[PDB]
Every structure is written in C-alpha cells, then in structure tokens.
Symmetry: none
C-alpha cells in the first residue's frame, strides 16, 4: 500500500534508490521508478 | 511489502484489526481485510 515518498516517510521508513540497505525490510516503493521504502 | 501476519510479527510489529493505536504508524497489512501492520517510528 505504500507507493509515494510522503507516505513512506510518514510511516517512519526511509526512501532509497534501487535497494534497501542491509538490515532494512522493504515495505513498499517511493513512487519514483526504482525507489524502495525501507524500514529499519 | 507486508501483507500477512507472520511477515508483520517477525519484524516486531503488531497486527491490529481496525487501526494503528497511539504512537504507532501503519507499515502494511496482515492480510485479512481491514487489518493493519503497525510499528512505532
């Protein structure tokens, strides 16, 4: 359900290009192509 | 994404049947309709 940067950041996650960095779980995208919404 | 209760709970979040309570934010669902995967920022 998470597909835009504002929603991602509001959820306490971080937007990153191409992949979530180690430890983080992917919970969605940030809308722009390739971006991942990543929760530590 | 998170769309089932096992994925949700493994990450240390809660599964709530209606809403994320005070201090928690929604990070997905727990599969069943209306359920919310919730975690404190």
């Amino acid at each position: 359900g998470i597909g835009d940067p504002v929603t991602c950041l509001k959820s306490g996650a971080i937007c990153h290009p191409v992949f979530c960095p180690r430890r983080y779980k992917q919970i969605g995208t940030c809308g722009l192509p390739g971006t991942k919404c990543c929760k530590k």
